[PDB]
Design an enzyme around this catalytic site. Structure first.
Site, short mmCIF file in Angstrom:
data_model
loop_
_atom_site.label_atom_id
_atom_site.label_comp_id
_atom_site.label_asym_id
_atom_site.label_seq_id
_atom_site.Cartn_x
_atom_site.Cartn_y
_atom_site.Cartn_z
N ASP D 40 0.82 -1.20 0.00
CA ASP D 40 0.00 0.00 0.00
C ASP D 40 0.86 1.26 0.00
O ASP D 40 1.87 1.34 0.70
CB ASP D 40 -0.98 -0.01 1.17
CG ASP D 40 -0.30 -0.02 2.54
OD1 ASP D 40 0.94 -0.07 2.62
OD2 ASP D 40 -1.03 0.03 3.55
N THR D 73 -5.62 6.35 0.43
CA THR D 73 -4.70 7.45 0.14
C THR D 73 -3.91 7.22 -1.14
O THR D 73 -3.30 8.16 -1.65
CB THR D 73 -3.75 7.67 1.31
OG1 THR D 73 -2.98 8.85 1.09
CG2 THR D 73 -2.81 6.49 1.45
N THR D 74 -3.86 5.98 -1.64
CA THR D 74 -3.20 5.74 -2.92
C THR D 74 -3.97 6.38 -4.07
O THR D 74 -3.38 7.00 -4.96
CB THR D 74 -3.07 4.24 -3.16
OG1 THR D 74 -4.35 3.61 -3.00
CG2 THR D 74 -2.12 3.63 -2.17
N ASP D 366 -10.22 1.67 9.48
CA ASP D 366 -10.92 1.97 8.24
C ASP D 366 -12.28 1.27 8.19
O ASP D 366 -13.27 1.85 7.73
CB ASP D 366 -10.07 1.55 7.04
CG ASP D 366 -8.83 2.42 6.89
OD1 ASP D 366 -8.89 3.60 7.28
OD2 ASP D 366 -7.81 1.91 6.37
#
Lengths: 497, 511, 506, 497
Positions: D40, D73-74, D366
């Site tokens: 990630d 966030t990627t 998350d």
């Protein structure tokens, strides 16, 4: 190989595209004192020295089918070059060439269908034909500097081409290159005109114009089997050169007189001493003629074509009723009164400059052509950027529906076709991106008739402005650009001897 | 990238030519040494004599040479003002493309500026009516006193007025033909003897036995064979004797009389001699026979004289003997060879019928350079009077037109809208180089002089200009320097035409 | 390099800074990135910071930034326009000197064109002024600040707080009023709408005294700095008691010092009391049992600012507990410190106008610093508008109106200054030039379009569009800038040219 | 081209998108350390070497989005990188930056509106909502590295959220960590659980405890006794606190008994004699705990701050339903069964390595987040390129509709959005261009649920497959990436000192 040449030729043609374009200057090699300035991209493509084989094959593939229709060259070359550049971007994005070929084939089919749907028929009404012909002449005669002289070309060409009403007379139309008076006015011949002098040695109003149609004229003399008695036997009698000339004149002139024809037309200038010979013998030889004159005589008065004339029956008794001469320009110009207008015509411009007359005759050739097929045809489409951007919108629409990877190639085709009105705007100095984007919006939300008005650089509802382009030239330029782009693209590697 | 670069290069070449020529402007002038392949020198104050012999490589230089040639053939003077306007407009173009505005808008804006400038120059000029001799002489003296040819232009100005009056009634505004009024020389002589010759002056004759003068001369236009042709060699057989060539010799002696009898039934009086490459032969042994019964031969005629005589006396061009009929014959009033004030065999034709009233001026002088300076003085005098008569209303010179035109063109750019407005403003504020060049060549601070001219044109007299013969800005003297309004019209129109053509030019290509 | 060539290179450097600043003009200004010695980054289009934070290793660039700084407070928004106009003036002066004009001549020509432009600016006037009813006109003027930066909701509250603060801080309003004392404060935290005008000073308080009367109608305030609990001049203090009853004796001494003094102080009319340092909450429990609302932890500068707000000066010992020495407030009220999660008591001193400040909150450090600069600019423009009620239409309209005026005036003189004023004209033209360059539309097309509109129709309120409202008239757009503000911008630009146009430095 | 580094630092991130992603290595700076891999991009950007200030700003936007969103966030970084790439391409096309900003903002407005109007609210249902919660949580957790036990964690999380009944509570779950073991050894259990060893001294057999937080233990030798107060003196006050503190031993029981006691909870060490005294009193005090979870203790048990018993009566009692301690294989872990808030659960993952552990707790945060804002505000969108294609289609429709230069800018923004599933497919190794063309065609013909099947490359109606993503994360990624690309673009040059 990579398409640097195919885009280089397009870039060097781009700035000439359409009216209000940019000029080019062509000069001879060796730093000799010779150059010329030209706007018609066809002239550059004719004069270009194609050092790149890709550019050579591109311009050759254009020339077979671009100068035929007329004025397509500046559009077909630029569209093909933009297609090749976009496809170079695609192959940089690892899109295989055959995918692009298939996508462009289907996209061109869609664009041609959209063009046919958007094309509007204008047959069966004379006033619509009048306005359409003046509009198309103005759009094709978009080359001269003087706007009143622009209108002069428009009216003259329209009235010359409309008087046909039938199958094409483009084979018979001509535009005489004789210099006249003011460089701002034009004229048409009520009977096709020659640069041949009349009156000093030949009759003025020639009733019973026989009009023998000869090709093998007298450069100096001719011959007939009679048993010549030459006096110049060898170097010992070089002073007797004139002896056989009179015989070589008479043994043809006498038999042509018995054929019943004094109106001897041929390309070759019969000389001054032969001018004495022919004038005294009672034959009115016309020292300039051409295929065009003979075929106009044929079409207007039921005549025919002849060749290799030696036998009297091999040429026609072209019984033109009467021939006169007219006083246009600074010459005594024979004027074939018998061949009236309506079946064919010849245009003559007044003006004392060959080089201006060159671009003039080029523009009238392309006009007379497009006029001829569009009278033979019945349909036209809104010109400027309207038609091409409409086809680009159709390609974009059907591209979105395409599942295959050729959807990207279809979008690339749409963008390349969209670039053509972009170049039209750029050569005119307007904001290209703003104009093309607002045009895309203007006729993407319906409003199919919306076009780009280059006369002021604003969106223009092309329905009432009247700027239209004939359907046949648009379809021909679309198909020719498609096939040329396919030919240039589908080759990947080149080898040379 | 490439189009901008190539346009920049074209502009740079044109500006290099123009600024190399800039110093040599106007009556004051300053020369250069010409960079040529022989290494000689030039003290030629004018500007035309550089372009006409300029080693030009870049096509911009060639097009500026065509500019200068067109200006000279149109109106003569101003041949340096045109090229300097061109250079200044190209410098303004350099600025405009530095800001990046498109060339086509430049061309359209310069066309608008041209139209408004022509309107302005036509407006402020003095509408002098050119219909009678007093107006013509006033215009002539105003045109001649302002140049350095004044000393000898005085005696020839009324005669040039007489010639242009012969050509047309000045109530007819159509331009007179510069080429129609030909200029000729009779070798040597004084200055005052340069006199008008109604009809034409003709080349010298051969006087074996032909008459020197003839009333009601029947001039014939002859271009055809003279003899049995000596076609390829002087002898056709063994050269022990001319056994068979005697036949062609006596056939010459017979064909000369055959053609003379073919002539006398028409009555050709004179003989213009075309060169021996067209003619079969020409020699005294036959020319004497032609002369003695009234066919006078005149040496080495040329095509310009043939065209002139055809235009004047109606003799149709001839290429063969059979057209000896009256179409090739003219019937003048009198033809004389005159040798007053130094002997001269140039024939004259007088009082012949003519559709156009062609007239020529003979030029005389103790030295060849004096004769040729008189010829160029009469040439430029006819140029200026013709460009006045075809357009009327001459204009004061000396950069006054440039100042007034720049001022009103700047305010026109003020009231004008669109992208073209700043283009016209730059056109106006760069066009002012001509008065700046006069100030530089006059010794005044050029920028201060231009400001003073612009200020005086504002809120005051619009005819004020830089005086070249007294010094500095002046308004009280109306006759500072005056040129026909067509001089400025041709300057602006040709300059803008070439500049907008240069703008139109892109991507120079070798064939 | 000396003389005209040295000045040529100097103009080149000035152009180098000017075109770098060029893209930041107007409400639609394109931002600039600043990386500092500390290594931090920030995006900002405000000219003042991106000159002050910017450094250029050339002396004339240093004079550029110094001369812009000297009129920083005087001209807030112009920090971009003055520099770009000076840059354009130098760019045209480059050509002028290339034509050979001596530098002081074009400097004096620029000064003459400045006089002409100023006199032309005098011809445009609006913004009738009456302090009570000006609220709507003044918030319409502050609409320029509102619609430009990141305040998408365009809070009328910030315009109102600014205009009320400036109109209240000086009762006399005619001219050159003393708006120097006011300042704005802010910190990271709640929403940008978390603002409050104070006719006094907001203190910082710890969250002891939880439910105590943070709002009291105290006309007078106890500014007693004596330590109720052991002091700390950076040095801690100690406790030592023999027994629990000895500590109870300490409690009764504490009770003397609390009830007796605070009864005296309430007799003098004050209940809120300051303490210089706090020690522990168990001592605070006695104060709570005394129902005392009190604050502490005031620093040296903090307590001195409190003194200047309340007019009273610190009382460190017992013998100075009289009414006259303590500071006045008139009223005290309590307002949330953040949005709602924390609460603050605020001391107004309305009986004197010598202390008015503005508190603003922000959700980010970038947000709070942007609010700082935006409110400072709004304060500057409202200050300069109320100092001189005459105003001119902005959005490049004033600059091109002056361009027409000075260009048409350029034909009035015979001297070399004519080209100087023409250079001034097409240099004043840069403001719409660059204001369209940093905007979307083509620069010259729009600039000349509005310039010719000012000729076809005489109203000089025409300028280029900067918010895509679809209209070139600025009267409905209301992108307006103070007339004396424009005068200061043009005059500072002319002086800023002059101060490096006459320089032949080493 | 001045901001190409901003593109590059997101370019080094596009190689990690999609569940079928592709790892890189963080090479430790300098020597004396070892490399470690990372799937990630969250860990990539976290402690990354940054060389370009615009790239630094992009990194800061990524961290801010991760802080306020959590997962994904990627996507924001890669989308911003694609936007900046296309922005530089448009700047090359001489399109001004501010037009790009305006068109981009309009495009994001339209795309967000279309996404909101197209997202599906699973709405008022129970069994269908149960299945929806199950599969959405499973697929959202599948975005992480874990593939095996995603379902168990997601089911446990949704069980906790259903105990919340809408009251989203990230602290309802108690999150303990324990090194060693296998990922299959991870356990959840209801209530609030402590991983210490308490045994019998504070018995595991107690009811309805009074849960408190008390930060002072018996090792602190705290002064607040019934005896003398704190003093600093040695004349006669050397160690009287040692004699006084003997009162605390009995006070810690009797004061709470006087207030009322059935049990007590203390989070600090207790000396032995009070340890058996509490054992005889019936008090369950824990030796140590994760003191960051004091808010968790206050919430799940209803406990309140006792002010370290400085003021014994200013607090209220906690509650539970049982006290227990269980041997979970190797850890004798304490079990407060059913504390006052029934939603209390304690999760432990037996990770042999701490990096799987840390990423697992990040994924659990998350999960609880997305379950919160998809239970109280139930909204989800089809992932796997479906959402990106749908909003790209909406933006392209806007671009065709809108006039002005903004059309090209927002069309380029739409194609940059299209790049995101193009990047996903490219990382998957499929025919990325063909696959995205097929999906684009599916949406153009009209399929708002059409997307990419990541397990085996092909398009598919994503509703049947059950693959999806939560609406909030996708919307925030789009908006944050748009505004980050905007703030990068709005700067032309960087000034350094």
């Amino acid at each position: 190989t990579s398409f640097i040449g195919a885009i280089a030729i397009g870039d060097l043609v781009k700035s000439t595209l359409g009216p209000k374009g940019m000029d080019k200057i062509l000069l001879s090699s060796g730093r000799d004192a010779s150059l010329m300035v030209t706007n018609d991209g066809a002239t550059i493509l004719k004069n270009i020295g194609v050092d790149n084989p890709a550019a050579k094959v591109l311009v050759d593939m254009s020339r077979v089918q671009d100068d035929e229709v007329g004025d397509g060259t500046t559009s077909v070359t630029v569209l093909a070059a933009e297609l090749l550049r976009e496809a170079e971007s695609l192959i940089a994005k690892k899109i295989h060439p055959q995918t692009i070929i298939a996508g462009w084939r289907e996209a061109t089919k869609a664009a041609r269908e959209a063009l046919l749907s958007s094309a509007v028929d204008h047959g069966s009404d004379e006033v619509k034909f009048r306005q359409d012909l003046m509009n198309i002449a103005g759009t094709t005669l978009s080359s001269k500097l003087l706007t009143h002289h622009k209108d002069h070309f428009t009216k003259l060409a329209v009235e010359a081409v409309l008087r046909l009403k039938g199958s094409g007379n483009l084979e018979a139309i001509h535009i005489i290159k004789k210099l006249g008076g003011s460089l701002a006015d034009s004229y048409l011949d009520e009977g096709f005109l020659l640069d041949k002098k009349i009156g000093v040695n030949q009759p003025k109003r020639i009733e019973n114009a026989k009009i023998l149609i000869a090709n093998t004229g007298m450069d100096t003399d001719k011959i007939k089997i009679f048993g010549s008695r030459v006096r110049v036997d060898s170097t010992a009698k070089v002073a007797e050169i004139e002896h056989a000339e009179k015989e070589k004149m008479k043994e043809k002139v006498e038999r042509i007189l018995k054929h019943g024809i004094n109106c001897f037309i041929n390309r070759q200038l019969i000389y001054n001493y032969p001018e004495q010979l022919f004038g005294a013998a009672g034959v009115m030889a016309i020292e300039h003629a051409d295929f065009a004159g003979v075929e106009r005589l044929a079409l207007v008065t039921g005549g025919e074509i002849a060749s290799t004339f030696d036998h009297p029956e091999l040429v026609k008794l072209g019984s033109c009723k009467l021939i006169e001469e007219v006083m246009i320009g600074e010459d005594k110009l024979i004027h074939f009164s018998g061949v009236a207008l309506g079946e064919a015509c010849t245009i003559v411009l007044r003006g004392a400059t060959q080089q201006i007359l060159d671009e003039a005759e080029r523009s009238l050739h392309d006009a007379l052509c497009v006029l001829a097929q569009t009278v033979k045809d019945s349909r036209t489409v809104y010109g400027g950027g309207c038609s091409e951007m409409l086809m680009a919108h159709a390609v974009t629409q059907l591209a979105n529906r395409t599942p295959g990877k050729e959807a990207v190639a279809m979008e690339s085709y749409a963008k390349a076709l969209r670039m053509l009105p972009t170049i039209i705007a750029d050569n005119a100095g307007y904001d290209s991106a703003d104009l093309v984007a607002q045009l895309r919006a203007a006729h993407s939300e319906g409003n199919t008739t919306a076009g780009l008005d280059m006369r002021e650089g604003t969106i223009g509802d092309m329905a009432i402005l009247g700027i239209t382009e004939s359907f046949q030239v648009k379809r021909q330029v679309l198909l020719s650009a498609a096939e040329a782009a396919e030919v240039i693209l589908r080759v990947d590697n080149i080898i040379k001897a | 990238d490439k189009p901008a670069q190539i346009r920049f290069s074209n502009i740079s070449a044109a500006k290099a030519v123009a600024d190399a020529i800039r110093t040599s402007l106007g009556p004051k002038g300053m020369d250069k040494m010409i960079q040529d392949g022989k290494g000689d020198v030039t003290i030629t104050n004018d500007g035309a004599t550089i372009l006409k012999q300029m080693q030009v490589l870049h096509p911009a230089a060639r097009m500026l040479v065509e500019l200068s040639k067109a200006q000279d053939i149109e109106a003569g003077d101003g041949t340096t003002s045109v090229v300097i306007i061109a250079g200044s407009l190209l410098d303004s173009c350099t600025k405009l493309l530095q800001k990046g505005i498109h060339p086509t808008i430049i061309s359209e804006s310069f066309q608008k500026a041209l139209e408004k400038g022509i309107e302005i120059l036509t407006d402020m000029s003095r509408p002098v009516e050119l219909s009678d001799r007093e107006t013509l002489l006033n215009s002539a003296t105003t045109s001649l006193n302002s140049k350095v040819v004044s000393q000898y232009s005085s005696l020839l100005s009324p005669m040039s007025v007489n010639a242009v009056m012969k050509v047309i009634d000045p109530a007819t505004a159509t331009s007179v033909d510069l080429r129609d009024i030909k200029i000729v020389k009779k070798l040597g002589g004084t200055i005052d003897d340069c006199e008008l010759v109604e009809g034409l002056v003709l080349t010298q004759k051969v006087s074996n036995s032909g008459i020197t003068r003839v009333e009601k001369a029947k001039i014939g236009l002859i271009q055809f064979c003279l003899s049995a042709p000596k076609t390829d060699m002087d002898n056709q057989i063994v050269v022990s004797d001319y056994a068979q060539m005697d036949r062609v010799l006596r056939e010459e002696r017979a064909y000369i009389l055959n053609l003379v009898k073919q002539i006398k039934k028409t009555g050709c009086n004179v003989l213009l001699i075309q060169k021996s490459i067209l003619r079969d032969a020409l020699s005294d042994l036959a020319l004497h026979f032609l002369n003695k019964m009234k066919i006078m031969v005149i040496k080495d005629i040329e095509r310009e004289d043939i065209e002139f005589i055809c235009k004047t006396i109606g003799t149709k061009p001839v290429a063969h003997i059979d057209q000896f009929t009256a179409d090739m014959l003219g019937s003048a009033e009198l033809a004389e060879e005159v040798n007053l004030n130094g002997s001269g065999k140039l024939l004259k034709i007088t009082g012949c019928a003519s559709p156009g009233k062609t007239v020529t001026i003979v030029v005389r002088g103790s030295n060849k350079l004096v004769i040729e300076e008189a010829e160029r003085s009469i040439h430029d005098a006819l140029c200026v009077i013709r460009c006045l008569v075809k357009k009327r209303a001459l204009i004061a010179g000396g950069g006054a037109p440039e100042i007034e035109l720049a001022l009103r063109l700047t305010e026109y750019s003020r009231t004008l809208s669109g992208m073209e407005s700043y283009c016209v403003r730059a056109f106006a504020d760069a066009m002012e180089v001509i008065p700046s060049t006069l100030a530089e060549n006059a010794g005044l601070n050029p920028i201060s002089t231009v400001t003073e001219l612009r200020n005086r044109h504002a809120q005051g007299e619009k005819t004020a200009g830089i005086n070249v013969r007294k010094g500095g800005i002046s308004n009280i003297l109306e006759e500072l320097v005056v040129q026909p309004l067509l001089v400025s019209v041709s300057a602006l129109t040709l300059a803008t035409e070439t500049v907008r053509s240069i703008l139109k030019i892109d991507d120079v290509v070798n064939t | 390099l000396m003389g005209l060539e040295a000045l040529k290179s100097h103009i080149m450097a000035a152009k180098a800074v000017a075109n770098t600043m060029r893209t930041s003009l107007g409400p639609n200004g394109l931002d600039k990135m600043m990386v500092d010695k500390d290594g931090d980054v920030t995006v900002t289009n405000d000219g003042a910071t991106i000159l002050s934070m910017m450094d250029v290793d050339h002396q004339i660039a240093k004079l550029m930034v110094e001369l812009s700084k000297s009129q920083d407070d005087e001209i807030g928004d112009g920090t971009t326009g003055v520099v770009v106009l000076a840059g354009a003036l130098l760019e045209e002066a480059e050509q002028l000197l290339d034509r050979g004009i001596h530098p002081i001549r074009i400097a004096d020509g620029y000064e003459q064109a400045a006089r002409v432009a100023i006199e032309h600016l005098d011809k445009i006037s609006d913004s009738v002024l009456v302090d009570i009813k000006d609220t709507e006109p003044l918030i319409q003027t502050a609409k320029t600040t509102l619609g430009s930066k990141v305040v998408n909701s365009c809070h009328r509250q910030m315009a109102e707080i600014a205009v009320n603060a400036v109109l209240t801080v000086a009762d006399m309003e005619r001219r050159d009023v003393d708006f120097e004392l006011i300042k704005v404060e802010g910190k990271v935290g709640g929403r940008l709408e978390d603002t409050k005008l104070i006719k006094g000073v907001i203190v910082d308080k710890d969250f002891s005294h939880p439910q105590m009367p943070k709002k009291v109608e105290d006309a007078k305030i106890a500014i007693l700095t004596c330590p109720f609990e052991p002091p700390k001049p950076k040095t801690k203090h100690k406790l030592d008691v023999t027994s629990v009853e000895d500590y109870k004796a300490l409690q009764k001494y504490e009770k003397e010092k609390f009830e007796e003094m605070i009864q005296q102080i309430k007799e003098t009319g004050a209940n809120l009391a300051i303490c210089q340092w706090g020690f522990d909450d168990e001592a605070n429990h006695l104060l709570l049992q005394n129902n005392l609302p009190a604050v502490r932890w005031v620093g040296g500068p903090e307590i001195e600012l409190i003194a200047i707000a309340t007019g009273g000066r610190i009382v460190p010992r017992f013998s100075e507990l009289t009414a006259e020495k303590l500071g006045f407030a008139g009223l005290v009220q309590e307002i949330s410190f953040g949005t709602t999660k924390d609460k603050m008591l605020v001391i107004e001193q309305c009986k004197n106008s010598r202390a008015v400040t503005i508190f603003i909150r922000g959700g980010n450090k970038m947000i709070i610093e942007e609010a700082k600069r935006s409110l400072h600019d709004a304060l500057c423009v409202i200050r300069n508008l109320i100092r001189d009620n005459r105003v001119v239409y902005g959005g490049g309209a004033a600059e091109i109106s002056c361009a027409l005026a000075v260009s048409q005036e350029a034909d009035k003189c015979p001297t070399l200054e004519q080209y100087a004023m023409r250079a001034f004209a097409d240099a004043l033209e840069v403001i719409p030039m660059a204001l369209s360059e940093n905007s979307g539309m083509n620069p010259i097309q729009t600039m000349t379009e509005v310039r010719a509109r000012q000729v076809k129709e005489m109203n000089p309120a025409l300028g280029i569009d900067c918010l895509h409202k679809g209209t070139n008239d600025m009267k409905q757009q209301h992108v307006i800038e103070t007339l004396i503000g424009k005068k200061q911008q043009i005059s500072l630009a002319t002086q800023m040219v002059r101060m490096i146009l006459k320089i032949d430095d080493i």
